[PDB]
Amino acid sequence: TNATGERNLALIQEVLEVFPETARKERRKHMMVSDPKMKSVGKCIISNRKSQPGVMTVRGCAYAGSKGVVFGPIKDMAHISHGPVGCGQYSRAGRRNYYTGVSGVDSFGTLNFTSDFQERDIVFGGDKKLSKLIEEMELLFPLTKGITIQSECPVGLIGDDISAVANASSKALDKPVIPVRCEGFRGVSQSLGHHIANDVVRDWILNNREGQPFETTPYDVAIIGDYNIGGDAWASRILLEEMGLRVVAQWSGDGTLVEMENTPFVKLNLVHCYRSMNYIARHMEEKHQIPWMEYNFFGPTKIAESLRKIADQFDDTIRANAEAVIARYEGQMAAIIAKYRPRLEGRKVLLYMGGLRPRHVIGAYEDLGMEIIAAGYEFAHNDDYDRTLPDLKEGTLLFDDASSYELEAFVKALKPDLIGSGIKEKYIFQKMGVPFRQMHSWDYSGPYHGYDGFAIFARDMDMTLNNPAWNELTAPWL
Amino acid sequence: TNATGERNLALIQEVLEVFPETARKERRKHMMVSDPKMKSVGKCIISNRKSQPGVMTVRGCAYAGSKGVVFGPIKDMAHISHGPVGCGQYSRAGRRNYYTGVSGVDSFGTLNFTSDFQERDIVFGGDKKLSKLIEEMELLFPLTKGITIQSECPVGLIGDDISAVANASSKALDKPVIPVRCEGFRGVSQSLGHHIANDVVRDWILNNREGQPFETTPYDVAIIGDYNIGGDAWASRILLEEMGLRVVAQWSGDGTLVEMENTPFVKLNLVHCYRSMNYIARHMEEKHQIPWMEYNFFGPTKIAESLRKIADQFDDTIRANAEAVIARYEGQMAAIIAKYRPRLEGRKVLLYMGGLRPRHVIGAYEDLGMEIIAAGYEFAHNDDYDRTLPDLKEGTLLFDDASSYELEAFVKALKPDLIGSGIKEKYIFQKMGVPFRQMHSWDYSGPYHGYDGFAIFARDMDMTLNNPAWNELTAPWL
Amino acid sequence: SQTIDKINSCYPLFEQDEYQELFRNKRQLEEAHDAQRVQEVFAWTTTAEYEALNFRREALTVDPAKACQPLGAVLCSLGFANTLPYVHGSQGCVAYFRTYFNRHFKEPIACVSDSMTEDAAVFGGNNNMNLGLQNASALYKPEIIAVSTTCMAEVIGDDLQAFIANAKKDGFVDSSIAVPHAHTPSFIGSHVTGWDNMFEGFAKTFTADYQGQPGKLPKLNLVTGFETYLGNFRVLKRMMEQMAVPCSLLSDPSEVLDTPADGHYRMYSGGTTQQEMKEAPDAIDTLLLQPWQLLKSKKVVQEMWNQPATEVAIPLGLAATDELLMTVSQLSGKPIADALTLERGRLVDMMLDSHTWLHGKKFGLYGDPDFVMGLTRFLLELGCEPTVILSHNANKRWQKAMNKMLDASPYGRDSEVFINCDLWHFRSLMFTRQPDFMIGNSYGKFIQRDTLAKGKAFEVPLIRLGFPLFDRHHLHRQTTWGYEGAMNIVTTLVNAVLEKLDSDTSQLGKTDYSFDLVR
């Protein structure tokens, strides 16, 4: 490797010295330094394994992946957090998966529906309570298009059978009632909740309109794996419609059961979050012969690449439209780069997030002259690490499921100018004097996808990296 | 006198022993004990004298009486506070003389227009600055109907001639521009400002539409002396209009220059505040042959007496209308007495206000079962003391232009259950543990005139006398 | 689109015409219910008929106003020196506990899990407990690892006590480290029950073998229970210093929830020391300041420490602060400080100065049982009417006490108390009972929004007092106990009245006859 690479390999060894020997050796396989010539990680890194007990992993659970990430955003369905009260309360309106609607009436994503398990539900089982719950829900919330049942830890452990409940209630309501066995002890992170949810969608939603008439166009697409954080999916949808495509469905930011049931009638699936929804994309290719492709709407270099490759799946009319859309936003892009690149050029960034953004935002940073010096994921798999390799400079530190200890140690040694990570990391690194931007919730700003999003992204990186308070951590007399 | 009269005469002696001998002898003539067999105060009290230097009199000045009280409420005219900046700033929107309009556009009572004298204005005189101010006013505030110039202390002292300026500017603008020599060193209190202002209205406003056609009815009246505190004059006007009268003018609460100019065409002038506007009522009787009468719209006993007497000046149609109005509000009045009189009756009140309300509100307190144990005025004249005697119980303390020492000593000795007085008295007496209601501003409530006002007055006396915090001034360990 | 000179975030970017056209077009692919039908259903959710069906619920909960046990065990643990909270069970819980407190305090929150998964569901989590204690000790070097549980661990029947005994015996955790523990099942009680359960675990670990003697130390211990205002820990210490009465708080997270941004991260800071906890049995007495939740803590104080456990009300308001200081004075034999009497008289001056805007005002309020009882009591003492009083996690014994207090007050005649009811129940009650204001936490923003959509005349504004407070900053620094806290409460209530009256009277040419400069 190069000099940067050696320094990072030595840093790896120094950081892991604190771990008991058994964990030390296991943790060493979760980190590596990148090679520009490598095309796949092979045995250089391992991922999607259990977390080490007691280390303060950043990860969440499979209920977070299913309820919190995939199903929670669907606005026209009521999602029931089934089990005791915590899970549903801590995850009530924490993720900014934007939607429009009339809350409590035709759209339900900010309400917290729960079966609030008590000790008698654990000793006698929760299915009778679940069935009565759904009757009460239908009475007080008549405009739901369908209902999901998101299982918390206790449900499967006490032997309940929510599928039998879902089938019975779906007949009585004449609406889809969807059971999900996303108990938080299953799998190792948020990731298995994604996979569980894709399999549930495959069997309980996707075939509901098979054989029905749907009026199509040649340029019908679905956005797969964009959860509209801060309106990201609306800022992506507008470009695809400007290019002459019809976005029949959005999975699942501002999404609906109806859009999802109409997805098997589209011509092309456009996968933004590969990690969470590649499963269903591959399934629609196999069963409905719908092609799919990955794309990236972070920053002008990746948006132009994406628009051109999407248009190249159609005909010369869409190709020409792709060129006209890029030319239409050229001025706006050039003014954003001319204003903000001089304020950010040369600064170094450390990124630590779930399963996509750690590699997906690197082009936007590079469009503002910034450099990534370390990148890691909470719960990515090896195919995500493979997908990261083309966008790293040689010697970059690449790592998986870091404890708080490891992330603190990496930041103290690397001295990034800017960190992009989550809410549990923000207030630690700000006290250490490092400018920090939340790159899950966008620090209550966004959108960051698309051309309208790049302006916001650039304003926000400048705002925080150059804020005057960062020169005041040390008192003037010290 | 009775045993209360004796106790009060001994209290007068005790309180005044603090004063240097000459002030003591002077101040002894400003207090007495009431005798129900007296029609006139005669020699028993004196009033409308200069205040004692250095004693902390409650009184204000002639600019307060002219600008603050009589002219400032007139909504369609711009009133200039002419002199240094204080006077106009301290009096900006402190008096709740309510009006409707569009501020700064067709109505000006919450703006402070001032000539902001600087040392060069004292040295060279302020008439040229006044003339140029009036030109800029007209450019920036074109919808004024007229302008008044309210002199502060320095204007007459430096020899300025604002009547020459007003005459020239009124021709230049072709609108009334009215000079007022209401410098605060004139007179002894607010009172001479009222008189000055009435003389200016007599000469500069009331003759403006003389000889002109005006469509009359047989039931045209003007409300003279109701400054619409918290909408008191609206709560009064509604009863007169329900009784079949047409209120052509209201002086000057929610009033206009137009209404004042049309006052000489009415059939009857209805004087509520005798102190501040008896002058112009007597002038209208002598010059225009318009009868006038005093009335009182505080509480149901006085309201019915007043409506019947006003109606007795017309004909049997209005006499029958007075009985219909009284009957119409009798259920509202019985409900207010049934809810609040039991919560107030028996309790003793001390009143200290300007020139009218210390006697005028006594009926409404008596309708709620309360007793007045002492009543005083800041600046009333002996004809006001004469008018107070019919509504006092034998031996009541009656006094004039009290110092703060004297009010505090009367309160300490008499131990009233409730005090009604002003903003400079409020926070002293609350600390002494005596429930206190502001009886100038209505403690940001009101109206108190009229049938709709009596409900609010009863609610407010109960709220404050019976509040639970008055039982908490002494710590429980003390 | 965006212009370089004025870049717009999500709101108001999506108000632009191109996005309004995008939404109209997207709506045609959703099979939306017609606007007329959505309007009919919204109106119907504001009615007395819908309310009656809403109050027939027996199985569905919607918009709860409580959290689960281990959250409260984590907050209690954070209040001891050099302590690392550790929750035995599944890791998603710890990601959520940390995030929940991160968003209220705007601070980092240390807490680990031992990551029980499918394997531990079948074998039990003793291997996770051994490796978890070992790795946490190595990485984070705590003096105390304070263990609570998640519902998976409870349901499978993991014997906490035995697991920790095995870790000790087999060398996974050193003898220098204390490992207090409590079972905290989220299907029992709420987060306030977890706090009390964790406190009993600390009392057993640090004092069970101690032979104490009440009044050997001339001090008072204070126990707050679950409290998320930093000013409340601080005011108690400040008042006790003015009384000249030695004091320890037992669980005080106010320094670790307020470390300076000086270039260093400090995982541990301040907190009750092991010396304070170990010598607790020698104090004169321990005062349990939130009595309805501190149930096992009262048995500790009386049955383990043989102290009086003098009964005290939550010290919220004027009369409850007077009663706390008289109790401190009686137990210690020391007079109430003149600076405290002066402060008390300034609060009474504020109450008299602002009473005409507060008297008769009608409030809805919700929160934890001890907080709701204290705030209802102080509202009665102000001459306000607490017409709708809700505590999702309160019990029937509390409800009987609340009704006893309300029946005895002239200001409680129209009050209704609700237990085991949630914020969807509260939402109907704001529509049907329509109090002037509602006092609650950030979840109440959606109820204010819902009442405003019926009409401006039906809006019930929210006043933020409680937990969690996620949509305003630095309210967690405030104080709500003591005279200092009652000054904040009075100021907050009168200025909420005055901000609403200004808004109502701010229409030029229409309602601004009463937009008074002075109020």
Place this chain on the structure above:
Amino acid sequence: SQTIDKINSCYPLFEQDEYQELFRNKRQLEEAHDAQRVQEVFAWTTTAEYEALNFRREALTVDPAKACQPLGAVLCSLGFANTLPYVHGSQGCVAYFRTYFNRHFKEPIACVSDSMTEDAAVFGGNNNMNLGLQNASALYKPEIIAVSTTCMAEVIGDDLQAFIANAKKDGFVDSSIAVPHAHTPSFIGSHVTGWDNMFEGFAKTFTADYQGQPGKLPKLNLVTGFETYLGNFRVLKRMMEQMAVPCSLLSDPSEVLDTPADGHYRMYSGGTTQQEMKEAPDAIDTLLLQPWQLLKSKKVVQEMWNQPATEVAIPLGLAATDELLMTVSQLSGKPIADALTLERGRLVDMMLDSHTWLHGKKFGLYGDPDFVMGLTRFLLELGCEPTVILSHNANKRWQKAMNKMLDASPYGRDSEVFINCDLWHFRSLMFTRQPDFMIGNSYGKFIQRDTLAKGKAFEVPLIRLGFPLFDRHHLHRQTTWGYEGAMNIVTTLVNAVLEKLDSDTSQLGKTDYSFDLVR
């Protein structure tokens, strides 16, 4: 009409049908301008064309943002022990000074006049002074009678020093009573000029012939100038006690403006003693904390007392507090306290936690010169843009210093500074420059209302920081100086942003896509 179960005050009584009808009938008797003409003129007053005419004024002042000198002298005088403020002149002035302070502080205000009338306009006010001092001494028993003047007195040219000597020589006032005086013409400067003049009078009375020696006492004196937040007097004392540096405030009215409501009225409470003022020349130095208005007080310190008068900026914000404590440290030789450095770090933590809501926000601001410079400085420190900056009573030297500070900062590039301009000028600027928010006193409420009447998109919300504050309660107890006051300012600013963003995003089904729970 009124119903017994719900009595309505003025608003909203007058919204009832019978009163809307009453108003239509009265309007027919006013010769009202037509509604379209009034709308036309209102729209014209919001334009740039109107603003240009407005900025041509030379003689008319509309809605001033200053008061007159004696108001300042009365406030200075209230800060000394057992002192009765006395204003030689006409009585109307004293009713108005007492009332103006009553409505801000919610407290009584002692002040007397000697009631000069037309007779006194002829012969001079010598008899009024003699009788006034005798009668005030008898009734109120002050130790100090602090004399200032109204404009009448100044125009007449009454010789205060000679009148006060004659009173003592003739036996009208006892010789033991201190009677400091100052000439305070309201046609010069403003209320801050009064305060500084009054202070120079106290310093002459108590120190003229004193043989002082700086550093004989190892203390520092502090001089606040005209200040109406009780917390600023109190934070300065608290910080000096943490620094362990002896100190006196010279003029401290914070006790007599906050006496307890305990059944007793206390005309006098606390205040600078005569011993503190008499020994003031023996301190190491005297720090003048509002330097632009403390002009004659700097001459006292340097010319009379031969102390440095070490220059200090108003201690508002983080960097200015830092500079204050470094100056205290350097003069005293004592280190900065570890508790202060911890408080500083917590303020920085707040700043970093809230910065994304404040960065780039645009504010208008007005008030006294020292305050406006201090708050403009701190807003630049926060990454905010103070685009419209007005001080009616400031001078050209202050305006030059302000533009220098602004030009040096990345955040001052669009900032405009106005002097000798009033709130009718500021109102135009709010329409043409449209900042996000304006910081002002209660008179700004009318400008918020005016901007809202143009439309919701044009509304500029008011943030209340300054004097007077008449339409909210108890803001006068807040702190704006030191780290404690900067914590208040940061919290106030960020929560004003978040309150407005919630209101803007609170429209059910329309803007509530961005009505976020967590901010």
